[PDB]
């Protein structure tokens, strides 16, 4: 199931769709790839075959 | 079980009741936690739940 999401994930009982600075957090983050990270942050050429 | 050991563990034939250094070591060794180390040498804080 390929899924796409943009809306802000909520962590409380209140409604939350686009409010920031509250317990709601963004469900995505951007990768940082540099040679200073050995194994923890390194890109890989992984391809799954079914 | 919970063990609190302060005496010297013996690893030879002479009784290491209070003498260490020649054939016996202190059983407690502190962790080496450096921020300049790799990802696999970082202090992870872990809790149990049974």
B44 has a chain A CB within 8 A of its CB = no
Phi, psi of B39 (to 5 degrees): -70, -35
CA dihedral B12, B15, B21, B26 (to 10 degrees): 90
* Secondary element (H or E) of residue B20: none
A32 has a chain B CB within 8 A of its CB = no
CB burial readout A8-38, b (16+ within 10 A) else e: bebeeeeebeeeeeeebeeeeeeeeeeeeee
Backbone Cα Rg of chain A: 16
Resolution of the experimental model in angstroms, please? 4.7
Alpha-carbon distance of B46 to B50, in angstroms, equals 13
DSSP helix, strand, coil percent of chain A (3-state; round to 5)? 0, 5, 95
Which residues of B fall within a CB distance of 8 Å from A42? none
């Amino acid at each position: 199931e390929r899924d796409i999401s943009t809306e802000i994930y909520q962590a409380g009982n209140k409604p939350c769709n686009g409010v920031a600075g509250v317990n709601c957090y963004f469900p995505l983050q951007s990768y940082g790839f540099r040679p200073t990270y050995g194994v923890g942050h390194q890109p890989y050429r992984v391809v799954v075959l079914s």
